[PDB]
Amino acid sequence: YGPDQRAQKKGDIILGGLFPIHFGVAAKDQDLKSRPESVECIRYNFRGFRWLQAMIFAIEEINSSPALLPNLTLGYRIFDTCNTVSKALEATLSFVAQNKIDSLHIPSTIAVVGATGSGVSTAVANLLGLFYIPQVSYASSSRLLSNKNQFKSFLRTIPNDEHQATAMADIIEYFRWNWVGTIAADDDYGRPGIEKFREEAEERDICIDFSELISQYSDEEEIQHVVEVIQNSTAKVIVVFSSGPDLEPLIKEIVRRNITGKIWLASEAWASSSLIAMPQYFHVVGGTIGFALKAGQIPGFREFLKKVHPRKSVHNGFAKEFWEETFNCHLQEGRPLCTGDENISSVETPYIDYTHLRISYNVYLAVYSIAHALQDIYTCLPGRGLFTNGSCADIKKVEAWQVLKHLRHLNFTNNMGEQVTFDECGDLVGNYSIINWHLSPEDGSIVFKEVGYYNVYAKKGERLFINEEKILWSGFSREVPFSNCSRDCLAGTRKGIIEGEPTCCFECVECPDGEYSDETDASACNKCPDDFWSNENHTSCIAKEIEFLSWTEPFGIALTLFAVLGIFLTAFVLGVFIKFRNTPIVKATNRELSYLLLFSLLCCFSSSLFFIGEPQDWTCRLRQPAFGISFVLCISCILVKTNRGLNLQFLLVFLCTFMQIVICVIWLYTAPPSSYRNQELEDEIIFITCHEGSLMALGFLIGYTCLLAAICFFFAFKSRKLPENFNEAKFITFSMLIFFIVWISFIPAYASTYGKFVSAVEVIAILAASFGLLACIFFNKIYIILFKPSRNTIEEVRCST
Amino acid sequence: YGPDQRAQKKGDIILGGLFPIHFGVAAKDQDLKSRPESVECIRYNFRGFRWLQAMIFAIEEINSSPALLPNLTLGYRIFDTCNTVSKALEATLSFVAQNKIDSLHIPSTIAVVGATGSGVSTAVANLLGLFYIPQVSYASSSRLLSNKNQFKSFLRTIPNDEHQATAMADIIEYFRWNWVGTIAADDDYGRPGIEKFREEAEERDICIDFSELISQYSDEEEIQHVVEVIQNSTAKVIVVFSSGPDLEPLIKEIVRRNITGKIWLASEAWASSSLIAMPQYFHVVGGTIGFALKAGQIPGFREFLKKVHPRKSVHNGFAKEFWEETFNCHLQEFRPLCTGDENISSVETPYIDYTHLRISYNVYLAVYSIAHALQDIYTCLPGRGLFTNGSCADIKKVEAWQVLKHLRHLNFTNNMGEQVTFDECGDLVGNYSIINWHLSPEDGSIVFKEVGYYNVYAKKGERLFINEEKILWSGFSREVPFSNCSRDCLAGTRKGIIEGEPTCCFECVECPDGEYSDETDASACNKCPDDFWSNENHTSCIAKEIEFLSWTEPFGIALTLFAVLGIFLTAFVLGVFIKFRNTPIVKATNRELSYLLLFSLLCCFSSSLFFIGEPQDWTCRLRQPAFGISFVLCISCILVKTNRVLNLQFLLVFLCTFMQIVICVIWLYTAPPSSYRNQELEDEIIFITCHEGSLMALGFLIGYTCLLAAICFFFAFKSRKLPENFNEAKFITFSMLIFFIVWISFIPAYASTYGKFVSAVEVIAILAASFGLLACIFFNKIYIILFKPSRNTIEEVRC
């Protein structure tokens, strides 16, 4: 037949069931020295007993209601799996026992309410699909069961895990973490979920540090290896796809070693597990964020639950062990002795200490789905069926494949006003709820508080809602933890690569002296336009600096004062000779060449005033010829009076000025000078300077000036001794000598300096030469004429010679 | 009862077997409108038929042998799986029929020769483990079957895929690639293998572009998506963990789109598959590199194979369909009519057209393992058994759990002289061979050429051997392909991050100025230490130059020659004055003062030699006073012999020197100058110069000298017209003018140059001033004393 411990009742139509009443089997590596025996189950499961009671309650309600299946009863045959494949397959062999008589007594089974674990469900479905017996599961959520090529008669009332993996990725992206590790159970439930999560997290630019597998039957060395892998890591957020039985040993080891500060993200299987939500583990598993399914209502279920008895439950064979485990007594069929009149409310167990019904509602829904398919078969009308020619099935000889067909074409409304339909893959979609683990002040137990939800019917990117103010991190903290591999670079600083490490870990390197950085996390430094240079902090770049000899400057003001003083002195000398024209010393110097020379000296100082200021196109063209013309005129006026025909004395000056003017015009027409902004000298600053355009013409001008100064020198030199005109040759020689020594002296500075000081030396040299010429030629004569010798030599000495 | 078509023979002990005689089942979309019927298998598998024949040959050889299991016979019951779970479970229910009757005319099965696919073997083992019936598989290599908490009676004669997944990464690292993609079958064989490969590749710093899943029953849309993923990638190497049936549709679609240039890494399941190794597909799948198992020898297998007959094989129910498929005719119990007189050497099929036996040898060994376990049960001695009190099992009433117990403790030698034994998880270990797909020049078919091996008994990093000169990369090329995400940086450039991409993809950025890099693939430019600056190419860094006025430089030699010439000239004027000491011209002035003046001229000239050369602290501190003191001594000597200066003469000169000396001493105690190596002015040049410490004191040492010179000027200027000592006061004013003119004219250049030329300017100024001071006074006296030996001495202003 099958297992001796069961819950069964007779009826017209029989339903099968598989529930975990125990958490596992005994650890016994049999050595095969004798014939093997049956294995034993260990730890009782009050939640599984409640789920079984939910199935029985639904069946009894259906049998009581006259509106769903009149004059037809339902039976059941329910077994225990102990979360093990081997035990489940023994019970499945009894389900198909009658059907195998024809293919290769127990009444035939129509449908089976599925298992809990995905591996157990796959093992059961492989065998149930041979005979086309429908199977409806309440807890299996693996994506591997959606393949209808291998599983032909599998349905479920629970959604699959792809949406939940995407939800975890969305949560991690919401809190702005990029450095996590993963842990998964080594079975059909954890591995596909963790693979989907990895695929989703890779496209959101999240780096995963470690990934490990665990099991209920792992050994101490494996546990310690996983613990060391966890301990050596800097990541704080850990994502776990597992259940309580598969997770308990690792949690126990971590608690013993006292590892704190971790952030756990829990899947639906262990997010509400009483094996892990223990008060003494809170310093490790406090403040967990996990997922929960949607709750439903079953009105009289609790009153039904409070009625179980070891003696009155004849059809329930698990009630005896339930009573013994609940009250820690022994039942003497005719540790203290059970008396049988105890109170269930006295002992606190997960049997009735619950707030929401989630998987129990799924069991209820699966039973009602099977009942509604049978009712749809019952109420068929001839000619309008789902079979060939519109024929209807026979309710007195209904078969499992016909029940499966009507299950595939099913649509009904539940007790809450919602529609229930199965898709082409036999899946049912639903929302998710997000919970946080708190600590109770009144009792000291774990309290699950809602903090958000995940809406599956919304557009991508608007599925997650979280109320952050209700979250206590690690159970007590109000601050969002930091889970990034490295700190973000700041303004002025740039990212660097570390060899052998993922893209999420980098080094902050400073930007160079020509580039800057505005925001955080720059992968390169930006070069800014050519008229700007980078700031010291390198946050931005400031404008460059323009440098030229300018007015409103202490140096330029002094130069201007010197120039105007020279102009005024020349004007005063001219006025002196104007006043004293008739008198004799003024006449023994050609009267009008003196005026021309003073005019040329005024032209000289004004020429110096050209160089001060910001260079422009129209000044670089005139500044240099202006000094040349005037100084050649000065030299000519001096040379015509030299010791060696009135209109002839006005011919030489015009001729020399004529050659000078002619050279400048040729040069300017063919290659005029122009302004030239200079940036190559320094990166930081810019110079505004004139560009000559032709050095040949400048050399020719300087050569002509030097040649004229030379001929004067040689001729003034040959006749210095003469005492005429107060030793005029002696002073002319001095004036020429001042010229040559000054210009030769300034050559080096022209050769070396490059900035705003090259313009200053030119003004200094011009003023020096002009003053040296004017003073030497004029001041001795102007002295006697006024001041003391009012008449001492004002006539006779001049008159005599 | 059970499946209709089978191979069956009765005996004392019955074995079970499962083989894929068909590649799959018909794609019937069942809508439930009738009582569902059995599905039908479609494509024939000659390789699977040969595998089935190997088991029968082994059993017949065992039955013929008289030294193994004497006076006992072996039977068998063999079914077909068609590579599906559902068909395999129908046969497995017949294997456990009698035991379940005992649990709750059927012969008992003690052992089953396992299936081919890992997914099928898992489902078969889940049911066979309930009754403790041992199962020995020949082809299932998933690592999930090593878990003995779930699979209590599973054994295999093939190694698992951990070493293969490691060897894939070993080969990839050997050929220096870091940009690959992965493809796996969606079952129990491909997913764990691709997971292990991903772990190892991430361990070896290898970047994976994409990862896709395929299946035999994938629709058009999934294949289109996979092809689109493949065709958008720049990766050229693809790792595949799948079989031929699950890989055929994708290969067909890629062939139709005719995508060339890819490098395929094949797992053992499809590395020798005839569904993929077709001459039409060669332009896409040419040059594939894959794995193979080690071949064995069965010394009578081919003659047994060549003897099959549809009418002489009574115990083989597959031979009729084998004959029909082979000869394309019909057997009587519009295809033509078969006879029994065809020759199987005419039609070329994988049945007898093979080179090596790899899985057939595994089947042979799987049968012989059970045979030797039974023999070990047979020859047990009382008190030396494996059971509770040392007892022995009974061969007449043997049981499957006892056979499993003896299987767990098996150790025997096979026909190749090798030892066979199963470890704690019921696994074997074995070598791998590496093959390369070539094209036959004569037949046009595909030839599998061996190019290496993988030794699993060696140490990590010494297990792979590749003979690279035997590899054709696309079937026609001898150059290793390039499969890196980005090109490698050059000598002067470093890496740079590309956001949104893995570490294997980067950009090259040039090193800045003052930094360099030298390795091939740098991630950070290096700042080489101070006193060094980068090259133009930023590849190596060179030493920068030290700039100072050097003795060996010809400018310094010329200045030294000038100084030496001045020193000598002073020596002749002193020697001449020494010769004519008491003569009238030398007696005219005070010779006691002329010697001091000539001695200070040498002191001045030598001060210039203190400027030339590499600066040091003491020379720098000694430069200025050495000239100042000597020149003030000269000036005082001249002054005290001008008109009406009034020994007191010696007093005045020394007193004036003592003032400049004290200013000098007050300077050195409070603010001495020192040497400096200047880095701020330029980048590639280092300047050695002097800071002058306190500039104010130097101001005093210049103003005092200028005032002393100026006073001498005025008083000489007053008396410029007395014809005494050959117009002495005419020449003193000239010397003062020369000194002032030289220093005034040298102002500009001193304040324009802060390089190595400033010292040259100072040297030139000192030399010019000293030469002027010499020639102003002494040249005229010498003029008429070198010649005119005594002409003017008698009455020079009346001597």
Ligand SMILES: *[C@@H]1O[C@H](CO)[C@@H](O[C@@H]2O[C@H](CO)[C@@H](O)[C@H](O)[C@H]2NC(C)=O)[C@H](O)[C@H]1NC(C)=O
């Ligand atoms: C941790 O790393 C993440 C990922 O780089 C950072 O999130 C980025 O934050 C900036 C500014 O807030 C955004 O412009 C980016 O779009 C974010 N990236 C992503 C992928 O969302 C986060 O700021 C980092 N946190 C800390 C504390 O460094």
Ligand SMILES: *[C@@H]1O[C@H](CO)[C@@H](O[C@@H]2O[C@H](CO)[C@@H](O)[C@H](O)[C@H]2NC(C)=O)[C@H](O)[C@H]1NC(C)=O
């Ligand atoms: C697996 O392959 C290795 C490498 O070929 C084998 O070791 C070699 O065996 C040959 C034959 O005896 C020796 O000549 C070599 O010296 C061995 N070492 C090497 C590095 O080649 C090994 O025997 C093979 N294992 C099995 C079981 O065949």
Ligand SMILES: *[C@@H]1O[C@H](CO)[C@@H](O[C@@H]2O[C@H](CO)[C@@H](O)[C@H](O)[C@H]2NC(C)=O)[C@H](O)[C@H]1NC(C)=O
């Ligand atoms: C492709 O990339 C790999 C790894 O980035 C390069 O392998 C390196 O090659 C250099 C020179 O041959 C060796 O010094 C390194 O040790 C190698 N690194 C590793 C991890 O093996 C390879 O050279 C690149 N190939 C091309 C063509 O650029």
Ligand SMILES: C[C@@H](NCCCc1cccc(C(F)(F)F)c1)c1cccc2ccccc12
């Ligand atoms: C005002 C002055 N200009 C000097 C330019 C120096 C220069 C700057 C750049 C290049 C060159 C050179 F390479 F051409 F020499 C020289 C000047 C102007 C006109 C006549 C002059 C005659 C005598 C003295 C000065 C004269």
Ligand SMILES: C[C@@H](NCCCc1cccc(C(F)(F)F)c1)c1cccc2ccccc12
């Ligand atoms: C060797 C010389 N050192 C002068 C440096 C400053 C300077 C450089 C160029 C020009 C001028 C000056 F003409 F303005 F002084 C000063 C020195 C040392 C000690 C005493 C001196 C007395 C007179 C002259 C030079 C003296």
Ligand SMILES: N[C@@H](Cc1c[nH]c2ccccc12)C(=O)O
């Ligand atoms: N979905 C889980 C089973 C499961 C869901 N909720 C649970 C609650 C408790 C225990 C198990 C479960 C699986 O496939 O394996």
Ligand SMILES: N[C@@H](Cc1c[nH]c2ccccc12)C(=O)O
């Ligand atoms: N070992 C493979 C099957 C296999 C190995 N070699 C083969 C050769 C041909 C066909 C299939 C195979 C698996 O577990 O699935």
Ligand SMILES: *[C@@H]1O[C@H](CO)[C@@H](O)[C@H](O)[C@H]1NC(C)=O
């Ligand atoms: C953890 O760290 C220790 C000490 O640093 C190191 O020796 C060890 O290899 C690491 N182990 C794991 C499993 O990461």
Ligand SMILES: *[C@@H]1O[C@H](CO)[C@@H](O)[C@H](O)[C@H]1NC(C)=O
């Ligand atoms: C199920 O029935 C409701 C009730 O009218 C209907 O609105 C809904 O479309 C039905 N669903 C399907 C899939 O037919």
Ligand SMILES: *[C@@H]1O[C@H](CO)[C@@H](O)[C@H](O)[C@H]1NC(C)=O
């Ligand atoms: C899921 O949640 C959204 C918003 O919270 C709600 O509108 C929707 O009706 C929910 N879905 C179901 C099936 O209750």
Ligand SMILES: *[C@@H]1O[C@H](CO)[C@@H](O)[C@H](O)[C@H]1NC(C)=O
């Ligand atoms: C391949 O590239 C094209 C062009 O960018 C794009 O439209 C397509 O979506 C890509 N394929 C996939 C699978 O992303």
Ligand SMILES: *[C@@H]1O[C@H](CO)[C@@H](O)[C@H](O)[C@H]1NC(C)=O
């Ligand atoms: C198997 O037997 C041989 C003797 O033939 C022995 O050398 C070898 O060690 C044995 N193997 C094991 C694993 O005991």
Ligand SMILES: [Ca+2]
């Ligand atoms: Ca009813």
Ligand SMILES: [Ca+2]
């Ligand atoms: Ca690494």
Ligand SMILES: [Ca+2]
């Ligand atoms: Ca025999």
Ligand SMILES: [Ca+2]
């Ligand atoms: Ca990317």
